[PDB]
């Protein structure tokens, strides 16, 4: 026999493994890379733990894989594969913890609401209090807790009862189980500033990349050629491919592969289409819509009740109160004996369905979905804003023209649908004006855009944007995937004033670029830094850009561009006589790409800013750019920082400085120019009266280089600054430069 603490270790592993293995399909066979990103490269699950404080936060939209991530953390731990530093892992569902109001202690939490030790309960708990650094607790769906002012009081006792919310507050501070690791998953709304005081690391979960989707479908589909054919479908059906970047949609696609592969279209395009397809699928396991209508309305009523009550787990009494019989439950929407909706998005969908079709819903109540007496209305007002936003988009979608006929089957009279469509339409039409006139609110902007798209009425989008005066649209770090690109394009394409569209730090990808194209003609500037865009994406962007007279700036810092975009870049530079700014830093451009693209730059007259920071254009790259820029009349700023340029390239840039009369700022930090290259440059400055800033930091330059430059600075009175910070100068050489020309910056 073994002591009580080791027995519990083994019990807990056994239970956690058993609860995490499946979701028959094994989670091990199915789990696919879903990258974690941290705000300030991007990390796999394995590095989740690579004040103080002790809490790790995983944030992501609904359906992005947060639950499935935690369940894989559990399975990996319980079977020995990763996270072995923890002797105990305690998984909790926040929506379940919310359902207990009777107070309880840490011991009751761990033992009665997770895993009961067979023997020695008190010894086990003591062991835990004594080794908290070997414990992990996970809390899935933290946004589904209801916190108060009454739950904000200190509580350091592990044995004394209190509210679950007070326990959790104090766990997060380190007042209970100090040094135990915590992992919380949450939707982006309910991460407040009070919480971040106690977070060691905050991660964002965006969804599958384009290759993730492919791996996912290969794991789920082993029958020969089926996965290939689904990938072929996605690569021919862009909007559907874009939806699958969210893991929940990849799941639905996989689930409905038969129906999707039968037709050559019309495939689902919008979010609502996808939810109707999975509804169709479930119904087939039992016109067919009409036949199960009372069920669907009973399910929808419960869903709406749940949302209004912020209740996502229903007890058998709540279920017979809402009146959902066992045939209702068998349909597939309620699961997992207290039940919950298959996913929170199905709760939202079923409530939207109820709002569109139930005779108990007054027309006017729909105004509370869009922000603008009856029980329906009272429920909507108390609903979590992020569930209302989901519900509202589904409502808009169910009321589109595509679905007139489908819904008409369910009614004796269309009068009711007419009234709800008209109301929703009225709200949507004024929603962008309403948004801007109420003074970051841009997540909310995005949901309004989503609802407009779901409605699928071109004219409504046009009305919504009429009279706006958007110049700059900032949507950094906003969860912008491919499908949000489709929604943006649908609305923004009607703008009459060119917009600076800022989508830095999202997951646009190649599919998103494609989906964005229709509104490219409405952009004066497009910022797509840090968005996983490859050569395929930019080549398509550039082809469309050639026909967009207003587009003058493109920024693509930090993507996956290689030399294979160079020809498209050369066309962009040679053919767009309007183009002002191009940022291509932190890609994989080499000397070959730079020589190719440089031909375009030679035939360009208007470009002002060209950025290559972090590529590797090298000597031959620098050479070709320099010769192409020798006669160029507009370029004012060139950056070649960190490009592995040496003396041959410095000679070329120096020969270019002899001829060029417009470049004002030349950024050469972090290369290996050396004294010889700085001598060349210095010669050039003697025949240049236009350059103002030459940056040479971190270039292996010696005092000899500084002397060559100082000599040139004696006969050049146009240059303002020459950066030499971090070069190998002795302290004595540093002292000696300080008395000489002050335009040297050290
Ligand atoms: N990493 C993943 N690998 C495979 N399937 C996943 C992954 N993440 C999510 N899924 C699938 O998508 C569904 C929705 O994801 P879920 O984790 O419930 O999202 P969230 O918890 O963020 O709302 C899951 O039930 C599962 O079918």
Residue numbers in the entry: 195 to 217, 225 to 241, 254 to 263, 270 to 505, 518 to 567, 577 to 612, 636 to 702, 714 to 1020
Which text from the study accompanies this structure?
We also generated a construct in which we deleted the loop regions encoded in residues 245–251 and 626–635, in addition to the removal of the CARD (OcNOD2ΔCARDΔloop), because residues 245–251 are not conserved in zebrafish NOD2 and residues 626–635 are susceptible to proteolytic cleavage during purification. The OcNOD2Δloop construct exhibited activity comparable to the wild-type OcNOD2 in response to MDP, while the OcNOD2SER construct exhibited no activity in NF-κB reporter assays in HEK293T cells. We crystallized OcNOD2ΔCARDΔloop in two forms (form 1 and form 2) under different crystallization conditions and determined the crystal structures at 2.3 Å (form 1) and 3.3 Å (form 2) resolutions. The asymmetric unit of the form 1 and form 2 crystals contained one and two NOD2 molecules, respectively. The structures of the NOD2 molecules in these crystals were essentially the same, with root mean squared deviations (r.m.s.d.) between 0.4 and 1.1 Å. In the crystal structure, the electron density of the ADP molecule was observed clearly, even though it was not supplemented during purification and crystallization. ADP embedded at the centre of the NOD domain bridged the NBD and HD1, and bound to the WHD, allowing the subdomains to be closely packed.
